[PDB]
Amino acid sequence: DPNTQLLNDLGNNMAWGAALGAPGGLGSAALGAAGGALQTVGQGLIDHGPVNVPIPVLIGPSWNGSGSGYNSATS
Amino acid sequence: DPNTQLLNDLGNNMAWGAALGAPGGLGSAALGAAGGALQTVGQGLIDHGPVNVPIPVLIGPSWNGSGSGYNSATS
Amino acid sequence: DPNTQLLNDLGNNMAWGAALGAPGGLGSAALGAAGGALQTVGQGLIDHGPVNVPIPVLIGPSWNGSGSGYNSATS
Amino acid sequence: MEITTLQIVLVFIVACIAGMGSILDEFQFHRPLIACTLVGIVLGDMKTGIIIGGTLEMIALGWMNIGAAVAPDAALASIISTILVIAGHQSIGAGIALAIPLAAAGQVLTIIVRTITVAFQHAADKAADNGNLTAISWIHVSSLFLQAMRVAIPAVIVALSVGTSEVQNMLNAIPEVVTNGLNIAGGMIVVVGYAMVINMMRAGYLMPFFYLGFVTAAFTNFNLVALGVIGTVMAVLYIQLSPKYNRV
Amino acid sequence: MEITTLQIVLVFIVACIAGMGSILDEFQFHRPLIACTLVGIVLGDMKTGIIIGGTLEMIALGWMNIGAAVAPDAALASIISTILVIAGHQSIGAGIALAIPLAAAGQVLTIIVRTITVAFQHAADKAADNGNLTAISWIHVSSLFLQAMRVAIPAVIVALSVGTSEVQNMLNAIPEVVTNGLNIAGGMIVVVGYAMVINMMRAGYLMPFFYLGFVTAAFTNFNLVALGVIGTVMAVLYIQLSPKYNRV
Amino acid sequence: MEITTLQIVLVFIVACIAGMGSILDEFQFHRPLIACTLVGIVLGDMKTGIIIGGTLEMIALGWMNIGAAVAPDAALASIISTILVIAGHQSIGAGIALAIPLAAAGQVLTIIVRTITVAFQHAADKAADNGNLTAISWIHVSSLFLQAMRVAIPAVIVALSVGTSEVQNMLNAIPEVVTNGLNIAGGMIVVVGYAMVINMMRAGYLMPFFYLGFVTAAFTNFNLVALGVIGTVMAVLYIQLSPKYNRV
Amino acid sequence: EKKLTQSDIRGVFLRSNLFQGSWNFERMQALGFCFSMVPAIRRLYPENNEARKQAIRRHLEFFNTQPFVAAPILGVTLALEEQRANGAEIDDGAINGIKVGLMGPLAGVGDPIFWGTVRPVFAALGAGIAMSGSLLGPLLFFILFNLVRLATRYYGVAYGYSKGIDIVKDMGGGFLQKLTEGASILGLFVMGALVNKWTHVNIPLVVSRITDQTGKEHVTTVQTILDQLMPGLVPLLLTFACMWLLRKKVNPLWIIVGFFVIGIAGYACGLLGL
Amino acid sequence: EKKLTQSDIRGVFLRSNLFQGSWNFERMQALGFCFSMVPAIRRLYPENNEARKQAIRRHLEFFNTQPFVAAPILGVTLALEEQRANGAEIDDGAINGIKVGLMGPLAGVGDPIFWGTVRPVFAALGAGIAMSGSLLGPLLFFILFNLVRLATRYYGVAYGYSKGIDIVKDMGGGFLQKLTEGASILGLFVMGALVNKWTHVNIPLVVSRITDQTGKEHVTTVQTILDQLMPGLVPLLLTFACMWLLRKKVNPLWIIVGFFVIGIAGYACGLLGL
Amino acid sequence: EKKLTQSDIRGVFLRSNLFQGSWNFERMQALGFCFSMVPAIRRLYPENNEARKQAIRRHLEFFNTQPFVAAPILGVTLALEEQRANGAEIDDGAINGIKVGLMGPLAGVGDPIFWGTVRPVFAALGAGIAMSGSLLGPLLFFILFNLVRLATRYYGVAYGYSKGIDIVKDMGGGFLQKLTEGASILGLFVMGALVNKWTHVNIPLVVSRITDQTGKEHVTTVQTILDQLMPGLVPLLLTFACMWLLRKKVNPLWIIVGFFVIGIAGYACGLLGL
Ligand SMILES: OC[C@H]1O[C@H](O)[C@@H](O)[C@@H](O)[C@@H]1O
Ligand SMILES: OC[C@H]1O[C@H](O)[C@@H](O)[C@@H](O)[C@@H]1O
Ligand SMILES: OC[C@H]1O[C@H](O)[C@@H](O)[C@@H](O)[C@@H]1O
């Protein structure tokens, strides 16, 4: 049920954002629909809250032998 | 009593240093009195010995959020 | 006994390497004898295997007060 | 469970899209977070597909392709593992245990296809001599088909024979030497792309900056962002000096 | 204990000197090591004053003012706390417990006065158009009076009403947000002085050295002494190169 | 045990070779790994000599001589200790306990001889004014004799009086101040050779690179290999710039 | 004269989505670069005289970079080709020169940013949200990543074209060579850093096996000694070997095959570790 | 001609003790700089013709540096003003140019030395001795600090004047611009270092809250990610914002007020941490 | 004309084995340098006219470097002396100039490589094998070290001569000064690094003795403060003092004697620690 609700919200927001950008033109319809979708996912993420995963940054291809996690600095 | 003795020593040394620099001139009376005072405090410090404090070096304005102690390198 | 065997092997290999380089000339007799000796010590080292010593690299004159072991980085 | 023919067609289409996204690396249709959910949707519960994708993504982070170094190819793993879990009735842990051998197999397959496309490149060379632009367009977009089939064919073979455990046995054909040997080789093929770029630059007098960049990355804690900033600063200052430009 | 009027006058004078030294930052009459001993001398035992000054100095280390970032102002704390201890008959620990809220209050007061002196600066601007040097001297030395009163007035109010615990209650008027908010703001106003200097330098082509100095301080263990040495070396070498100067 | 006169002559020859190798620092005949085995061969069992050499080498690692800083001179220790062990019938641990005082004594002796050879240098200066090359050859090869005797004489004195424990007593003549004072002095004489080279270079405008090399070694983890690479890179780039060479 | 219509920029933008897709070991991403410039060459060289074939062959050369930061290079070469077709003389080595000069830095700072921080941050957010099993995970990842990818592609093409039409407007002022020089310097620096950071060679031949610390066992190998001398020395030597082989006009395909064989055989023989 | 008497150097030295004392947020330490040069302007421009007003306005400009290391700048400007009043032509931007050029490095290495190592070393010695409660503590601190402060002030004025009367003796040899360029380079370097070292912005918005290590709880915030990308990135962006605002001729007082309001409000809203 | 026979290179190589052996504190390794060039001066200057004495005095000057990497300098000076005796004008400061320029870097990277990594690696292998007590230990060390020493000596002489006969073949193209400048830069850098790395001064005067951490006792000395300011500051000041003394034409022998006396006396007085 929550997944279907999320899909409906995404559809409504994208349609509304496309409608808002109609006077600007076709080049602005995309800039409206994208904004609608982004607002949907942002609102959902804010409702969810924090997350229990390590969130890696500046990692490298550690699958060969390189260091793992943040700048390949972990052997 | 020790504080009064220290004050008397400071006065005597400053007066003696000023007297020693009299032939040089007024510009040397200051350079004599300062030397006398410096010798007084140095002799007192040598008598006291070491001290039980951390002695910080190259610290920064840690009162905002900066690191504390020696190069702001302590979180 | 093993030491005498090692000496005999060294002599035989150096003589053989010198003989191999005879057509090249006196300048190649040395390059043959050196190769023979090097092969002898290399074969012996391979037979011995690993060794139980720390194997230091890039050390400095630690006898004054400098750091000891690998880049003088150990107080 | 048994699979209807409509679901077979749908899983074929999803596999084709994931295969093309594996080489394009643009829309991330080959990442497990998307492929697993799509397979779950076309096969049954979205719940299990999403969960498998989420669990496998954390492994697949850092499965970058870097200049002729081919990563273990999350697409084939993320598709076949979820087909085996949702249809073959296995535990999520058991399916994710199969992620790594499947990744190695996909790595082999994509390496083979990337060597094959050299024929397409040479065909484009021949089409150049006739000045045929439409031929170039067809040659480029026709080399995606191979990358699509690369994932599509095994993902239909597995789906059609889900009532057997022979896939786990076929996974043991590549014993250990190639599973780990490929990563070891990829620990050195990262060099080749940079070597080709440097060889094409034909700037031998600027080579001191290469060594400078090397040792700086070996004995310091600099980021790649910091190294980019430093490199830009040195470029600007080198141009400011260098009397070849400051000529009266 | 009660305080004689002569001691009130003396504590007023000591407070004025400490207040002026707070802004001058020259003779360090505002540091607790000096202010506490002076108050102790004029009030009674030098013993307690010296001990309080010694204990409070270790906290007040690193209460530097750095380019429009105002520190918590040791003068007001070091004066009022010792007045409360020697005259109000409190424990040394209890008095030093009041050092931090008093420091925050003094920080607020000195920020207000430093905004007020802008009127004096503009009056000096107006006096410039008449070429009046004596007016400039009077305007400069007359802006110290405000900084003296800033510490003198509360330090007389406290001394006159020592037979009450209302000062500890008035210390709770500034609840928590401004006590900590001022330090947080001071964590960013350090930037403003450097920004003003850089804006006045009008050297945009030397700005690469700014970024170079930034990242070097973020990923290395260099001192500020070492960074000064490095900066001097780069300045000398830049001048040695740079054909703008090496012209035949 | 007693020593035959032939063994005395042989140990004299081995000591002479080790002494010359101490100053030449070419064939490493003065390292314990070689000197100990040679003494063991000429005295008796090679087994004990090899073992003592192996044990003492691990201590003697890092007994480099660096530009007028004289190390503790492994030659005298490595010879006299094995003479005392093989002939004087002591435990290997007891003999190696004597390695450090013997090293200090050898350090003193070699410092004295290295001050003496200044007379030889000045004699070569005088021979230059006559353009006598054979005199220069004789003067150079005749200054090795002193370094040979430096080790040979005590190594014969010890061998002739092995039936007494007086060597351990004579080792206590140098109490503690010179044993440790020499190393402390050597912690500063490393500077002198570099100072002489820099003074002879007569390049004051390149002195910024000296400070740059100093602080870089104080706050970073760079090797000496890395510092050599960096120095070469800066030399090349300085020559590329520097309009003194890029003149039209 | 001949000029690029607005409709011929979107055409370049749209075709750049399939930038890879013909990815070889021989000339990586080259056919994609020539494929995304077809709408331009279709306008600047309307006929097959001789300049069309030269223009096509000019862009079927080695070109490897991060797929997203290649729009600026596409725009810059669009401007250069427009000027060259209109008559202003841009040799042939200034086009390929600027392409190769910009390939370096953009691949050196594109990978550690897009495959580096950008993709796994969004992927980790989406994966963590997907552990509970809500559609917000995949949707978040997909939307957030593509809104960055599309933005950088479109506006990179636009900005590259606009800025490249100003580099040629002062031709003779020495701007192309300045840009090539600066790009080469930055690219060489970052590639030198990445060769050390992202490569791994391990030679597990035990040299010493001291045993102490009640069984710490302190094993040291050849790799330990080499890492003490210079970390990453073997990949640096391999880089120089590859450059030497490419000098001798050896096909890159055989170099890559040799690397694969060396890796597999060395791991089988037990002298390449992991 | 007009020259500075010896008595007019002590006058500059004595008045420099009250260097601050009129410290504004608008033009920090500027009125102090104009106040300590009154005995000089009183001699070089004995009349109020027009050059007196120009000379006064020249020194009521922004001038911020460490109070103790400002004597060298005072001496240098004394020499420059002497030469300019005697006739040699020093524009107007070479005086303010050298002042601003020397402001940077002297504030960048003055604070970490005087407010840095020098004051707290003596203060810690005195405080430790004062724990027992002997007068040696405060006396030690007072005497040792003032014997350094007075020495540096007096001899900085003297040395700056003496060395500045040699910079102008070879005017036309390009020395002022060399000195300004070198001072600007060093100052920019040290200020860039200090912006990173001595600033602190903390955004405590929790992004992930993994719990492991039997309760280590491993919280990561937005600040953690930003610090992994580039430490001190937010203060760097704030520096550029302040520079942009100052370009637009915004009064610095409003910038400082905005900073105070932002800090207090952000801490109240709980998105500025500590 | 006069040219160096092949037999006169081996003669230089053979005599360079006794490179040290007359090692003074006054002119370290100088007589060895003049001794290893005797077979050359015996050919280029067959008579004692005046150039023989000048040639001899030219090489009895201060010359200190790592003994093994001195063959390249020997070869280079062989080439320079050949050209100068044949007539081409090289003066008396380009020979000593290049010698002193090459002394720096070769001693700065020779010691940490030969006395650094090369000798103790072989010595440790041999010592570990000798613990069991087999002849392979000493034989391994001896053979492996001498096969490197002899190779570097012989081929350094050969390569230095061959490369130095090309530096003079384009005399006037500014090559000698380029080489001297580059060698001086690299040498100054590495010597500056080594002065910090390989020196040690310790002043154990206790300043503070805080006691906490249930008895960690946290002693701080003068050396602690100095090391916090700048590590190795005292040896740097000593380097500058030695340079100043050498400027005043003080004999180095008295400097070394003073250093020994200072070390022993300071350790006796207890203010030089260890
Ligand atoms: O970085 C170089 C670049 O090379 C190829 O185009 C692909 O492997 C990319 O993924 C990679 O980023
Ligand atoms: O450093 C800049 C300088 O600015 C102002 O003048 C005062 O805050 C000083 O304390 C500070 O040192
Ligand atoms: O490094 C300088 C050099 O000086 C002298 O020649 C000897 O002490 C050598 O051992 C040393 O290497």
Residue numbers in the entry:
A (entry chain D), B (entry chain G), C (entry chain A): 4 to 78
D (entry chain B), E (entry chain E), F (entry chain Y): 1 to 248
G (entry chain C), H (entry chain F), I (entry chain Z): 13 to 286
Can you list sentences taken from the study reporting this PDB entry?
MccE492 has a modular structure, with a toxic domain at the N terminus and an uptake domain at the C terminus of the mature protein. The structural analysis shows that the N-terminal toxic domain can be further classified as a man-PTS recognition domain (mPRD) and an α-helical domain.
A total of 92,052 selected particles yielded a three-dimensional EM reconstruction at an overall resolution of 2.28 Å. In the MccE492–ManYZ structure, the mannose substrate is localized in the middle of the membrane. Therefore, the ManYZ structure in the complex is identified as the occluded conformation. Binding the zigzag structure of MccE492 prevents the movement of the Core domain. The α-helical domain has a helix-turn-helix motif, and the V-shaped two helical bundles display amphipathic characters, one hydrophobic and other hydrophilic.
